Curated annotation (Swiss-Prot), chain A:
Membrane topology recorded in Swiss-Prot or TrEMBL: Peripheral membrane protein
Source organism: Mus musculus (Mouse)
Chain's gene name: Ache
Protein name as it appears in the record: Acetylcholinesterase
Its biological purpose: Terminates signal transduction at the neuromuscular junction by rapid hydrolysis of the acetylcholine released into the synaptic cleft.
Keywords: Cell membrane, Disulfide bond, Glycoprotein, GPI-anchor, Hydrolase, Lipoprotein, Membrane, Neurotransmitter degradation, Secreted, Serine esterase, Signal, Synapse
Misc: Synapses usually contain asymmetric molecules of cholinesterase, with a collagen-like part disulfide-bonded to the catalytic part. A different, globular type of cholinesterase occurs on the outer surfaces of cell membranes, including those of erythrocytes. This is the catalytic subunit of an asymmetric or soluble form of ACHE.
Length: 540, 536
């Protein structure tokens, strides 16, 4: 047929499809099974390498989304729907995608592996905003985006157990990585320049790979957008993981009656429950009412993660590492409508003070009273402690800083200090297209469109600057991808992006106006969160 | 034959004053008038008993003894330090007051201004050149009274509940002086119905105490608290602490409460002064040995309690603070600070100094403080660190307690006026790094720049006038604003809602909202909870 859309892989033949990007043709190999479907008695189990196949495996289309909760908060609303599954749900979802430029690159092009985010409970490479055709067509890079097990399926764990040891949604990603290694070669990809890049929980994931030895040998560069492995939401202890597994199990009738004491039977029992049964009780295992906290996520097992990601970034050796890190203007905005009284995407959410005080307890569930006070002290504007507008924006700040920004900063600094070559940024441009209210500004995850290059598509209603902007962004990423320096290669155009350093603390303003270097990532505020607050908590 | 204008008859007898010359004219001055029987011998530690009547004409032309106290020998010969030291023979017999009126004495009853001097309750005197009534008297026509009150062990050593050493006597001395004015001030042309109290540091604390003590409250109508409050970390002590110290000091000099006080009364006054500092419990600064005890008598409850639950509708108050309240004190106990160099310190000193400045803090409380006052972008910059250490001490001990008091008073009916003094005396002898320290506003209020003999500038003289106008207008009408003269900058009341105060500097008045708002919420609201959580 066409040697361009026909490829032999370590397991067998494949057939891609030829996509048409604004600037030209692209080869796309969608739905490549990287592992044997983790269904049946394989559920909660580490993934296994897909067995070799006979004939030509079709790969002209997107596979099934892993089993996960579907958002029903705002039915029909693009702002939420855009994140929901666009393919059928199934426990048989272990496939990855590959975009290569048409025709295949002359020599070993650098590879950009994307890891989607969604609180470790949702997400899919199948998504529109994760369309890696532009970054291949335009920047000529080999882009790979895989699907990994979310929710209970990916992270339910009974630490120490043989049949649900946890973190399998990560081993999924790791397995996709080992694949890209021994197989990307055939797509014109360089198995020597693997640059991982993900947002939210994907970012947190990327971090996990950096912190996990076995994952090291599978990548060389890393980008962590709006998320880290060290936060208050990305991991749970062994005890908590268990307490939530058993509880979820219990709710689903596992085991039935007053029988118990055997984890194997407990999992065996769980393995028989319809997928939707688990998803039904996913949210009932949280210990307190909250936001930006997820039920099933990576666990500190002492295997995939040898110790807390905190303890790891604190004492790891990141000398050789080259990382790109960042954040958006208002991380915490999106999460407010999902459980904080007074907040809706429909009104301006001009909240009362009491609403704000309550909100603080939700957004910071692990906080004792005194610690809550501290947070209130810090975020209240005492000249106007009643102004609804402040209270509103302050709530978004508490959430966004606590969960994303400060942890980012804590990582960046701890990384740089450890030997890493870190680069930081603050995405501040609010897409014109954006359907969420003005009050949320630049919400968690609204940088993707630009990094992926969606504004390049003419049909989509993006402004010309946004297009130029997107290209600029794609440039930084791909540049960081090949070189390990997001800067205009040789061609020293103009503004330079300096490495974030402990002493200097430099990050850049990623927006319409050319680069604009700044110092201190909420330095003051994050000193509160990263230095003080912790000891306030470990006292109370 | 006598000058009819300098001969005054007072309840205890007659007295002759002296005609003084102020820059713009003559002024009458009656100095060293006794208002109490000499608190000596067995009268030591005891409350003041009224001055017994005398015969003949008492000589009220010269200042009297300064109350027995400690003398500041830190920087021998240094004006900025000596300007506060005793300028008359020390003696226990020091209970006298001074009145300054225009010359000739005013025809119409004029508003009285009563000055209570600073000095951390361990020192001070009305004898001091900075507390000179002559300018206020001559330029504004005020009747200015100022008294001496016992300090240190003599005026504040307490064995709560005993008869022979009840404590707070120095505060009683001031009250007695306040009564004396009530009675006798009419004789000089003063109006007993328009008494306005004003003080600085411990002086302002004392003023606050009179506001919070019922008896004293019916002896004045308005008040001005300059860089000082009744509430706050240093102004008062528990009854148990007061006793811990008193008992300790007693033991330190070789001494049943009665039998103890008896022994302390045989000790030479200097023996006491020498040991008064040995009783402090911790390595600190801006923390004094013998201050007002909360006896449940003069002070029914704590000033904190009292300002939170009191009626203050019938009160007009002027409160303020100078731009660099902390500096002066760093020099006294925080390593790395000297008047001689620029005192740029290392983060290590800043850290060890916060424990000096907030001696009562727990490691966590301290760390909370450190976190607040650090510039995390340059946590090592000695300049910022130096400036910051000064703010910790100023905010903790003065600025915030003032903001607290302003809010509580305002909240509970009072009419409050607030300011921040920002001008640095051109003639200032303290290093430029100390900015406008604690006490360097006084000389302007009292009108010293009006004396051409002193080397102030023309602007400074004009400034002094403006301030004297502010104070007197307030002492006169409860409002510091120029009445008829709807001039230019109008000074609005501090309200809990708007939180406005003004800038007292060479430029015209400027209104500012929120007095160290965010920082004071840390000290006032949060720090205490954290403090109690981590307490002993
Ligand atoms: C922004 N994306 C999507 C890319 C990543 C964010 C994932 C976190 C979603 C927060 C809302 C959780 C709501 C939980 N429920 C629906 C159960 C209330
Ligand atoms: C300017 N006036 C006279 C109105 C106020 C003077 C206040 C004196 C400050 C002394 C601080 C001592 C601190 C404790 N140690 C002994 C450690 C220095
Ligand atoms: C916004 O709307 C939600 C639900 O419609 C409501 O709970 C909230 O009180 C509203 N807030 C304002 C400020 O209108």
């Amino acid at each position: 047929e066409d040697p361009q859309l026909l490829v032999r892989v370590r397991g067998g033949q494949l057939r891609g499809i030829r996509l048409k990007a604004p600037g030209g043709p692209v080869s796309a190999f969608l739905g490549i099974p990287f592992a044997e479907p983790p269904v049946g008695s394989r559920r909660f189990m580490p993934p296994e390498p897909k067995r070799p196949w006979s004939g030509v495996l079709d790969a002209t289309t997107f596979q099934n989304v892993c089993y996960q909760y579907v958002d029903t908060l705002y039915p029909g609303f693009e702002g939420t729907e855009m994140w929901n599954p666009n393919r059928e749900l199934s426990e048989d979802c272990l496939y990855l995608n590959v975009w290569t430029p048409y025709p295949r690159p002359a020599s070993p092009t650098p590879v950009l592996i994307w890891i989607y985010g969604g609180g470790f409970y949702s997400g899919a490479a199948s998504l529109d905003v994760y369309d890696g055709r532009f970054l291949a067509q335009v920047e000529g890079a080999v882009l790979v985006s895989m699907n990994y097990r979310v929710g209970t399926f990916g992270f339910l764990a009974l630490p120490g157990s043989r049949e649900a040891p946890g973190n399998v949604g990560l081993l999924d990603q790791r397995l996709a990585l080992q694949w890209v290694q021994e197989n990307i070669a055939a797509f014109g990809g360089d198995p020597m320049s693997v640059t991982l890049f993900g947002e939210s929980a994907g970012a947190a994931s990327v971090g996990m790979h950096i912190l996990s030895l076995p994952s090291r040998s599978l990548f060389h560069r890393a980008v962590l957008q709006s998320g880290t492995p060290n936060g208050p939401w990305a991991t749970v202890s062994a005890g908590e993981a268990r307490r939530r597994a058993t509880l979820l199990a219990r709710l689903v009738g596992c085991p039935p009656g007053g029988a118990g004491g055997n984890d194997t039977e407990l999992i065996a029992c769980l393995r028989t429950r319809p997928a939707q049964d688990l998803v039904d009780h996913e949210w009932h295992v949280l210990p307190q009412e909250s936001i930006f906290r997820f039920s099933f996520v990576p666990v500190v097992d002492g295997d995939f993660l040898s110790d807390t990601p905190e303890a790891l970034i604190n004492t790891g050796d990141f000398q050789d590492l080259q990382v790109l890190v960042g954040v958006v203007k208002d991380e915490g905005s999106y999460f407010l409508v999902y459980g904080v009284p007074g907040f809706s995407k429909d009104n301006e959410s001009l909240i009362s003070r009491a609403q704000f005080l309550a909100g603080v307890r939700i957004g910071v569930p692990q906080a004792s009273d005194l610690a809550a006070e501290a947070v209130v002290l810090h975020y209240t504007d005492w000249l106007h402690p009643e102004d609804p507008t402040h209270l509103r924006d302050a709530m978004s700040a508490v959430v966004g800083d606590h969960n994303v920004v400060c942890p980012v900063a804590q990582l960046a600094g701890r990384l740089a200090a450890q030997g890493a070559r870190v680069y930081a940024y603050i995405f501040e441009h609010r897409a014109s297209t954006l359907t969420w209210p003005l009050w949320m500004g630049v919400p968690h995850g609204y940088e993707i469109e630009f990094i992926f290059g969606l504004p390049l598509d003419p049909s989509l209603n993006y402004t010309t600057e946004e297009r130029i902007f997107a290209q600029r962004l794609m440039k930084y990423w791909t540049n960081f991808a090949r070189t390990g320096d997001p800067n205009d290669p040789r061609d020293r155009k103009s503004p330079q992006w300096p490495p974030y350093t402990t002493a200097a603390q430099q990050y850049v303003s990623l927006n319409l106006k050319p680069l604009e270097v700044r110092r201190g990532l909420r330095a003051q505020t994050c000193a509160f969160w990263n230095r003080f607050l912790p000891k306030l908590l470990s006292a109370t």
